[PDB]
Amino acid sequence: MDYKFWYTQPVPKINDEFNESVNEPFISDNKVEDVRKDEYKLPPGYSWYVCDVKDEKDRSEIYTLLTDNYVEDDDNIFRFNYSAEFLLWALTSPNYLKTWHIGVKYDASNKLIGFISAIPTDICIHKRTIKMAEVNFLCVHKTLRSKRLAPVLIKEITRRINLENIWQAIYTAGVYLPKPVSDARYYHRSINVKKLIEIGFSSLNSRLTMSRAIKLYRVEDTLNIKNMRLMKKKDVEGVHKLLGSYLEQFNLYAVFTKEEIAHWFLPIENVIYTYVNEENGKIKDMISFYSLPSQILGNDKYSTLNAAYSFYNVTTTATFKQLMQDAILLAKRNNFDVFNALEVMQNKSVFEDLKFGEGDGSLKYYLYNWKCASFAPAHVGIVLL
Ligand SMILES: CCCCCCCCCCCCCC(=O)CSCCNC(=O)CCNC(=O)[C@H](O)C(C)(C)COP(=O)(O)OP(=O)(O)OC[C@H]1O[C@@H](n2cnc3c(N)ncnc32)[C@H](O)[C@@H]1OP(=O)(O)O
Ligand SMILES: Cc1c(-c2nc(Cc3ccccc3)no2)oc2cccc(OC3CCNCC3)c12
């Protein structure tokens, strides 16, 4: 299309394509002293609001906004429905800034109608480790769309990030925008076939009768890696070394400190599940997935799709296929209806064998103020929320 906001930003033009040797900002030698100290102007009747995500009621306001107004399927039957506890987890990572949790209220009602957030993350792109902001949960009320409010929320968080002497960010979206560094399709592994069939997530065809679809997806309730267990605090140094060593092979990944591993992976019910295999006091395999329900739009029988999303999975004692089979099984044991995954890291390699179906669209990865060659999603080693 035209990208009249994006073309004023430091991001590639749609036709830009860079050599592998290119790996730099679009704009360097930036100065915290020069950054605007004034808040970006909102339309008359709207005000900035600083959300405190540790405050139950502020967190609840953001929860309601996203519940009613966040990402939907381009057929409009499902809306992402992140839990309040998930938001807490997602937004209170180590060294997070309260002031990168930005809301917009309509003054006359005092209601939150807009939101955008960022957490700090060390990101390695093509073997350069950069302090970045990981931006997410950009949301404008459905009553207020196409009013050019998103660029205000965007310019306003950029300014707040820049005040911290950070000049780059990472972000993902399903819409195509100038310009992805990688593009990863999503795949779904049915667990509760019948429910999926009933709510129109999956389909039957004459050869695949209901009972055949159910038999197709059925799994044995026995782990390939028998000692896979919920991670605990004692496990963090071992996960740090396992995952950390594994991630170094990729073109794009997060460099986690121990404190970050503890946050990202220590299990929280209905938010984040990590399983580990400990052999001789070493952590040799891990599995992790997060909970992201979709509200079912207008179904007289089901209100919620329980979905597990593949997070970080490493094996040194089994095949990757065996590990991901256990991951599916662990997700089944925790009452999930489906197991989603992106064609990132080694995932694509197992989708056919493990009966994944191809989804409808893809997820684009983006960098802000960074210039580099684009790459296929198997070289992507980071999963955003
Ligand atoms: C160094 C620091 C850097 C910090 C910042 C880095 C950058 C971070 C960037 C943000 C990353 C967030 C990642 C994220 O949270 C994960 S992706 C999910 C985003 N949220 C949703 O989709 C919720 C449902 N939709 C909405 O709330 C609205 O449709 C939104 C608010 C998306 C757009 O509201 P709207 O009412 O429909 O639209 P206008 O206000 O009229 O604005 C139109 C302008 O916004 C551009 N747009 C639309 N969707 C976008 C998107 N998903 N990313 C970036 N840009 C997006 C669009 O191309 C157009 O610019 P253009 O004319 O050039 O085409
Ligand atoms: C986003 C996604 C999908 C997926 N999205 C859709 C369309 C949709 C929209 C709203 C509700 C339900 C469905 N269909 O599938 O599967 C995925 C599998 C893995 C990861 C995905 O994206 C996540 C990381 C980035 N932000 C949100 C979740 C996705």
Ligand SMILES: [Cl-]
């Ligand atoms: Cl401006």
Ligand SMILES: [Mg+2]
């Ligand atoms: Mg708008």
